[PDB]
From a paper:
The BisI family of restriction endonucleases is unique in requiring multiple methylated or hydroxymethylated cytosine residues within a short recognition sequence (GCNGC), and in cleaving directly within this sequence, rather than at a distance. We present the crystal structures of NhoI and Eco15I_Ntd (N-terminal catalytic domain of Eco15I) in the absence of DNA and in specific complexes with fully methylated GCNGC containing dsDNA. Both proteins are homodimeric, with each domain involved in target sequence recognition and catalysis. The crystal structures show that the modified cytosine bases are recognized in the context of double-stranded DNA, without base flipping.
Numbering used by the authors:
A (entry chain A): 8 to 20, 22 to 80, 82 to 86, 88 to 115, 117 to 160
B (entry chain B): 8 to 87, 89 to 159
The structure:
Amino acid sequence: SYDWLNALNNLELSLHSEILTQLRSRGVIRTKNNPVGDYAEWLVSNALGMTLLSNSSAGADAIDADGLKVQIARRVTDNPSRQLSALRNYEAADFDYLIAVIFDEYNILDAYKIPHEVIRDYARHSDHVNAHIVNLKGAILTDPRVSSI
Amino acid sequence: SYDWLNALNNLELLSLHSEILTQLRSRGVIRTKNNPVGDYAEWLVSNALGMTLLSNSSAGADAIDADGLKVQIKARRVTPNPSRQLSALRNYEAADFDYLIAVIFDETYNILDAYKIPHEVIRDYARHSDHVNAHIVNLKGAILTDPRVSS
DNA sequence: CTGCTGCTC
DNA sequence: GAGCAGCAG
Ligand SMILES: [Ca+2]
Ligand SMILES: [Ca+2]
């Protein structure tokens, strides 16, 4: 039962920082960011045997056992949207395939592997943020060029 | 004494996080499923300095004050990552706020630093990132010593 | 297609 | 200074 947290005030509800501390100390998350993103890296890495890369700098986040760079999610439990995080400098082929995963605010729902190419045919560019934007909705979910896990 | 947490596994911990977020949202502390710090800051600044929020956080402003001015609200939790690089002012050239307020937290969501930094003083120390098409500012050194910035 | 928030090396 | 993540309308 999660109804005991009505007793804690706004300051005490400090506990979320503590949970991040625990997850960090367990290896689940590296950064103090949105916990969904690092948990995605964590699950994908351990599952199919991937060495993570702390330097996601304009590049992938992991390498498979065949030496291929992998870019690693979105948690749609209050507003259903599946736009993936921004992709910058994509014209340079900085990854060999991408793994995108949906969580339920944090259980797994969907998960896909997409070559850098399929992205091109499912991406639009925004000058405002200087990034190609993609949404994991509908079409791309049915390209046989994409695989699901 | 948060030693009882170790009894929870990963999925239950993540559930507890999101659930805690849903509490503060139900209390009106936050408006999104993003980082509780930013909306908690926005919540903190307005309900303490008499301001009015704008969920239409698009003009680059996040609230109007008692005097009737636009204010951009940006927060950050530095824990000795001690970098104090603020969020993108993706559009600042249009100048859709009068004075910016940046608030600095520690791990336990406590106020280490807070400044009311005005717009032209933001113009005097800003740098533009070609990568993200946005201006970036840091609050360390010359910015703090500027006579046009207060706490 | 328009926007946001915070965080790391 | 370069980079990063997820999230809202
Ligand atoms: Ca990633
Ligand atoms: Ca803000």
